A paper describes a structure:
To determine the molecular basis of the specific interaction with PPARα/γ, we solved the crystal structure of sanguinarine complexed with PPARα and SRC1-2 LXXLL motif. The structure revealed that the PPARα–LBD–sanguinarine complex was folded into a three-layer helical sandwich, with the C-terminal AF-2 helix positioned in a canonical active conformation, in agreement with the agonistic nature of the PPARα ligand. The binding of sanguinarine to PPARα was stabilized by a combination of hydrogen bonds, including Cys275 from helix 3, Arg271 from helix 3, Tyr334 from the loop between the β sheet, and hydrophobic interactions, such as Ala333 and Val255. Surprisingly, compared with known PPARα Y-shaped ligand-binding pockets and ligand-binding sites, sanguinarine has a unique ligand-binding site in a novel PPARα ligand-binding pocket, which may represent a new pharmacophore that can be optimized to selectively target PPARα. The R271L and C275A mutations decrease the activation of PPARα by sanguinarine, but not the PPARα-selective ligand GW735 in cell-based reporter assays using a GAL4-driven PPARα response reporter. As such, the Y334F mutation decreases the activation of PPARα by sanguinarine, but not GW735. In addition, the A333G and V255T mutations both decrease the activation of PPARα by sanguinarine, but not PPARα-selective ligand GW735 in cell-based assays, which emphasizes the importance of these hydrophobic interactions for sanguinarine binding to PPARα. The conformational changes in sanguinarine binding with PPARα can be further clarified by the superposition of the sanguinarine–PPARα structure with the GW735–PPARα structure, which revealed that helix 2, helix 3 and the loop between H2 and H3, shifted outward significantly, thereby increasing the affinity of PPARα with sanguinarine. Compared with the GW735–PPARα, the AF2 and helix 3 of the sanguinarine–PPARα shifted outward, which causes SRC1 to shift inward, closer to PPARα.
Residue numbers in the entry:
A (entry chain B): 688 to 695
B (entry chain A): 200 to 257, 263 to 468
Write the structure that this text describes.
Amino acid sequence: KILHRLLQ
Amino acid sequence: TADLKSLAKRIYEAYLKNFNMNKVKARVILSGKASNNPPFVIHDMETLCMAEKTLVAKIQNKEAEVRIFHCCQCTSVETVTELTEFAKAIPGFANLDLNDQVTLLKYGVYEAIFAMLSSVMNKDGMLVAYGNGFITREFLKSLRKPFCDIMEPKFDFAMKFNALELDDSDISLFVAAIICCGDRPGLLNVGHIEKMQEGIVHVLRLHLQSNHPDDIFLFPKLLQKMADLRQLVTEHAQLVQIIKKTESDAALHPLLQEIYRDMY
Ligand SMILES: C[n+]1cc2c3c(ccc2c2ccc4cc5c(cc4c21)OCO5)OCO3
């Protein structure tokens, strides 16, 4: 989820 | 186009745009022509304390090792962020599923970090704090275990990796190949990532022929370094576990927690 977020 | 000319160029430019450190800059700081005053040598606790005093000035009840360990983590979180932007600039990567993107980075980033670490390491030690510090190889070996065992494998790897005498263009394509790997566990759209990797490796082969005409066996040497990295990571993941379990004031950063979960 923090990794989802960086790919924003 | 699909043209490998524009693939190499776009990857080299995404590499220069997105990484604070690289080999050219590293070589310039280590010759002493980057600043009026060269990097601060950290070789004992005396100098480590001067260095922390001036470059951070907030953690003096927490043990030296625990603070150095905090710093390793801060640097990974930064480089993971640079790598995600770098990834996003690789032709084709933007067009992948979000879940495939997460996977490729989850397994990609530590291989990439150790590959790029090599650029800031010589036989004597490594640049830290955005090029402002030089922590000695020996000072790191002379920490209490298990912390003195982190970097030593990375120096071993980097010493041989650096002997290949690659430049930043060669390294840009090499990081791109690490990230776009079709056999990561969990990958959904394997066939499209395999085709993407086939292209990068291909332009990498072509790039090495023209850029390194002397070393005819350089391409197979680099493919082997990618296997070697995959195994440097597993051993490091294992060593970071020992530390999570057997060390109180060393709670891993939450981003690195996700990355290490279910890993190997
Ligand atoms: C732990 N760190 C992280 C850093 C960092 C930076 C830039 C500089 C630093 C830094 C500079 C001096 C330090 C000195 C220290 C230390 C840690 C640091 C330190 O622990 C003990 O003495 O960008 C991302 O993360």
